[PDB]
Scaffold this active site. Structure first.
Site, PDB file in Angstrom:
ATOM      1  CB  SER C  45      33.949  36.449  40.437  1.00 58.25           C
ATOM      2  OG  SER C  45      34.361  36.200  39.103  1.00 58.25           O
ATOM      3  CE  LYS C  88      35.609  40.059  41.207  1.00 60.58           C
ATOM      4  NZ  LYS C  88      35.144  39.037  42.181  1.00 60.58           N
TER       5      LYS C  88
HETATM    6  B1  LIG Z   1      35.627  35.842  38.515  1.00 61.25           B
HETATM    7  O1  LIG Z   1      36.525  36.795  38.872  1.00 61.25           O
HETATM    8  O2  LIG Z   1      35.388  34.792  39.342  1.00 61.25           O
HETATM    9  C1  LIG Z   1      34.903  35.928  37.122  1.00 61.25           C
HETATM   10  C2  LIG Z   1      33.650  35.050  37.142  1.00 61.25           C
HETATM   11  C3  LIG Z   1      32.748  35.182  35.921  1.00 61.25           C
HETATM   12  C4  LIG Z   1      31.446  34.418  36.111  1.00 61.25           C
HETATM   13  C5  LIG Z   1      32.469  36.641  35.610  1.00 61.25           C
HETATM   14  N1  LIG Z   1      35.813  35.513  36.066  1.00 61.25           N
HETATM   15  C6  LIG Z   1      36.957  36.146  35.787  1.00 61.25           C
HETATM   16  O3  LIG Z   1      37.221  37.275  36.195  1.00 61.25           O
HETATM   17  C7  LIG Z   1      37.928  35.381  34.889  1.00 61.25           C
HETATM   18  C8  LIG Z   1      38.504  34.182  35.649  1.00 61.25           C
HETATM   19  C9  LIG Z   1      39.575  34.533  36.651  1.00 61.25           C
HETATM   20  C10 LIG Z   1      40.915  34.472  36.303  1.00 61.25           C
HETATM   21  C11 LIG Z   1      41.903  34.788  37.222  1.00 61.25           C
HETATM   22  C12 LIG Z   1      41.563  35.162  38.499  1.00 61.25           C
HETATM   23  C13 LIG Z   1      40.238  35.222  38.862  1.00 61.25           C
HETATM   24  C14 LIG Z   1      39.248  34.907  37.943  1.00 61.25           C
HETATM   25  N2  LIG Z   1      38.993  36.163  34.298  1.00 61.25           N
HETATM   26  C15 LIG Z   1      38.779  37.169  33.451  1.00 61.25           C
HETATM   27  O4  LIG Z   1      37.877  37.997  33.578  1.00 61.25           O
HETATM   28  C16 LIG Z   1      39.729  37.231  32.291  1.00 61.25           C
HETATM   29  C17 LIG Z   1      40.239  36.064  31.749  1.00 61.25           C
HETATM   30  N3  LIG Z   1      41.078  36.077  30.711  1.00 61.25           N
HETATM   31  C18 LIG Z   1      41.383  37.275  30.220  1.00 61.25           C
HETATM   32  C19 LIG Z   1      40.866  38.437  30.749  1.00 61.25           C
HETATM   33  N4  LIG Z   1      40.025  38.430  31.783  1.00 61.25           N
END
Ligand SMILES: *[B]([O])([O])[C]([C][C]([C])[C])[N]C(=O)[C]([C]C1=[C][C]=[C][C]=[C]1)[N]C(=O)C1=[C]N=[C][C]=N1
Ligand SMILES: *[B]([O])([O])[C]([C][C]([C])[C])[N]C(=O)[C]([C]C1=[C][C]=[C][C]=[C]1)[N]C(=O)C1=[C]N=[C][C]=N1
Lengths: 426, 98, 182, 49, 49
Positions: C45, C88
């Site tokens: 993402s 999102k």
């Molecule tokens: B994503 O949604 O792919 C994004 C990519 C990044 C380059 C901005 N990362 C996240 O949103 C992450 C990883 C994730 C975890 C679970 C499901 C999907 C994606 N998570 C978080 O933003 C996060 C992680 N720990 C605590 C709070 N928020």
């Protein structure tokens, strides 16, 4: 004396004893059985709770023990030097049988003796499906229980009679019962979630064919793309340097690097770096499939060559440029045909496959019907040059050639790199 | 090379499919003459053999069918006879005498 | 950074290389970082967001901060689909509403995820009222064009601005190496 | 491209909502014809599914 | 059991059906004997049209 229970050895005296190697080694009785065979005598197993125990005379062994099982059970025992001289005779079962009318008649007789009622067309379709299951055109599958299960399904779908329609329905149902993943993939492709260019031409990208590891019988195109940038010779396969590429995939990147080097030498090295990566993450590589696909994509990226996106490309390639055979070619071809049909056949979609796999082409009825109608085009190639010629629709040699375009692209990249180093030492 | 349908066509054609088929049962290990010859040699010589093949092929059923049609001299009647309340030995008798 | 995220930096590096070649390499180093620590990455993402931010940094391009950007990108530049697009979009809409909608806030999302857009009643009502603007894009060029509010091609183009920025960075690097070998 | 509300609108419209609904029970495995056919075949044939 | 009863094996005329998530099944599909016993696979679609 009357409490001695007869085991397998006692009941097999004067005849043949049939054992399973994997089960025999699983119970850990191999040592005692081997000692009994060596001595020719054996005593019944006695409990350790016996105060004195009976003075049982060893039982003479006059049988011919036969071990039946998969080879993998036997490389667990063949290392023993005592196993070699006991079993002087090795009976190896061929995974396939010759696809001949005599063999088809024998299969029909076996099925009739099994209890099924067959017709000529039903027997013919069973023979064809066995050949396809063996993956080879001129070799049927020797797994008789699989054919028996398919015949049972055909009998159920046809009321007991094994007609051609009933067996066709059985095969269709067998395909459809595990079709959920492919159905979801087709839905995603139609909805645009997974965008695959099956029409027109694009530069540096090609519809590589993959077979899903979760079910190694379903093929689906994977949009591989390659980007060429000036720099060091090292070739980047982005989908490998993330923990996904396997040991077999390790050989692939070096193979393409060697071919790209040795084939194009008008500078001391390759003035480009190639970034190979599929669009998706369901392509965790285990094997040298795609191959030719990566090579043609990298060459198109180098030469700015718009590859025909309607033609999928598969097949391993060597550093000589010769295209090698790959497994599950039928699955890849059928998956690409399914994807093209989902988006609608335009009369030009097709698959680039090695001529080595021509003996493995056992495509289903729909694919062959489409090929006959001219809506689908199966291409067989020997070297990567032929595949890239088909993709770009022009000859390598001569003016407006593919080779000269790739050379001009490499020359331009080298000029840009030398301009960079000129600015570097200024 | 652009393959044609004829080169790609692999299903054996059907000229009549509405009639039942009546075929004699095939010999055991049909299309597998290597294994059949191995079993023949092991049976004639009395050696111990072992069957090797891919899983779920019918090795056990085919081997049982092939061994059923075999014919050997009737084995002698082998039975335990007690020489005493503690000593028991093996006795060999002509078939049917036990 | 996760294993899925590992190939993301290589993907952006490959796209930035292959897309902009008037020097033998990229004369810049790009520092990607979120300001916060609740973004431990697991997945591809953001993606397009990272790419457009890096391109704006290269070309000194003021991106419209009212438009959020999401969606993975490939080394070809095509914007890939992502999961939980509804979450999102709704989260960004919630944040914008908390600070007050100005009639120009929106989300940059891939057109591939258009089949996954099942936004709640409030978001659709805001879009109908014109207070919110959902944008669907195919390639990163469209997304950055929307962000910067101008075309890639032509004079005063975005592509020429990025090329001029890369040229200026290369000139400064070659000045450094000139002082180096003096 | 700037999506419009009509392209984004996905909730099926309601023309009347003040009345109760009376619908017959659906067949088992509704909307899942693959699994229903698999069970039909396994039941007719007696196979283990 | 000191000697135990001489129970005759119970004939099996049933049709066993296993229900669970796939992850439970990749814990058993590797067994070659599981394949020919369960010739029918009933897969439940995560979504409906
Ligand atoms: B994503 O949604 O792919 C994004 C990519 C990044 C380059 C901005 N990362 C996240 O949103 C992450 C990883 C994730 C975890 C679970 C499901 C999907 C994606 N998570 C978080 O933003 C996060 C992680 N720990 C605590 C709070 N928020
Ligand atoms: B191949 O078929 O050799 C191909 C090579 C790659 C360069 C495109 N890879 C795959 O198809 C991989 C590895 C594989 C696994 C099992 C059998 C054969 C090959 N598999 C997948 O595409 C895959 C893996 N995990 C999930 C889904 N799909």
């Amino acid at each position: 004396v009357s409490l001695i229970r007869p085991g397998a050895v006692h009941r097999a005296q004067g005849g043949y004893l049939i054992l399973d190697a994997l089960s025999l080694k699983r119970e850990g009785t191999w040592e005692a059985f081997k000692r009994a065979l060596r001595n020719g005598q054996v005593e019944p197993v006695t409990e350790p709770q016996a105060p004195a125990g009976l003075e049982v005379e060893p039982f003479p062994i006059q049988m011919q023990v036969i071990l039946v099982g998969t080879p993998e059970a036997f490389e667990g025992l063949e290392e023993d030097p005592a196993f070699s001289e006991l079993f002087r005779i090795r009976a190896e079962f061929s995974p396939t049988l010759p696809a001949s009318p005599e063999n088809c008649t024998a299969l029909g007789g076996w099925l009739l003796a099994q209890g099924f009622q067959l017709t000529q067309g039903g027997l013919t379709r069973l023979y064809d499906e066995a050949r396809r299951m063996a993956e080879q055109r001129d070799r049927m599958d020797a797994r008789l229980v699989e054919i028996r299960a398919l015949a049972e399904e055909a009998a159920v779908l046809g009321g007991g009679l094994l007609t051609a329609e009933s067996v066709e329905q059985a095969i269709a149902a067998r395909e459809h019962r595990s079709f959920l993943s492919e159905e979801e993939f087709l839905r995603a492709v139609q909805e645009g979630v997974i965008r695959l260019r099956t029409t027109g031409r694009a530069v540096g990208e090609v519809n590589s064919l993959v077979v899903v590891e979760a079910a190694p019988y379903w093929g689906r195109p994977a949009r591989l793309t390659a980007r060429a940038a000036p720099g060091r010779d090292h070739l980047i396969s982005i989908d490998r340097e993330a923990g996904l590429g396997g040991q077999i995939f390790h050989k692939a990147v070096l193979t393409l690097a060697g071919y790209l080097r040795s084939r194009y030498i008008e500078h001391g090295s390759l003035p480009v770096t190639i970034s190979l990566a599929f669009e998706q993450n369901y392509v965790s590589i285990e094997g040298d499939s795609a191959g030719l696909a990566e090579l043609v994509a990298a060459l198109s990226a180098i030469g700015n060559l718009p590859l025909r996106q309607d033609l999928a490309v598969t097949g391993a390639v060597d550093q000589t440029g010769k295209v090698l055979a790959v497994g599950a070619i039928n699955a890849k071809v059928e998956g690409f045909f399914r994807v093209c049909k989902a988006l609608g056949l335009s009369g030009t979609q097709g698959v680039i496959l090695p001529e080595a796999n021509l003996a493995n082409l056992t495509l289903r009825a729909e694919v062959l019907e489409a090929v006959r109608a001219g809506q689908f085009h199966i291409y067989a190639v020997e070297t990567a040059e032929q595949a890239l010629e088909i993709l770009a629709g022009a000859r390598m040699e001569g003016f407006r050639g593919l080779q000269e375009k790739i050379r001009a692209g490499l020359e331009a990249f080298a000029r840009l790199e030398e301009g960079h180093d000129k600015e570097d030492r200024e | 090379m652009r393959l044609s349908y004829e080169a790609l066509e692999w299903r054996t054609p059907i000229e009549n499919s509405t009639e039942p088929v009546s075929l004699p049962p095939p010999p055991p290990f049909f299309g597998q003459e290597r294994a059949r010859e191995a079993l023949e040699l092991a049976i004639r010589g009395g050696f111990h053999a072992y069957l090797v093949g891919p899983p779920s092929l019918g090795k056990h059923e085919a081997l049982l069918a092939y061994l059923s049609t075999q014919s050997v001299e009737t084995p002698p009647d082998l039975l335990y006879v007690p020489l005493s309340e503690r000593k028991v030995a093996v006795l060999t008798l002509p078939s049917g005498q036990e």
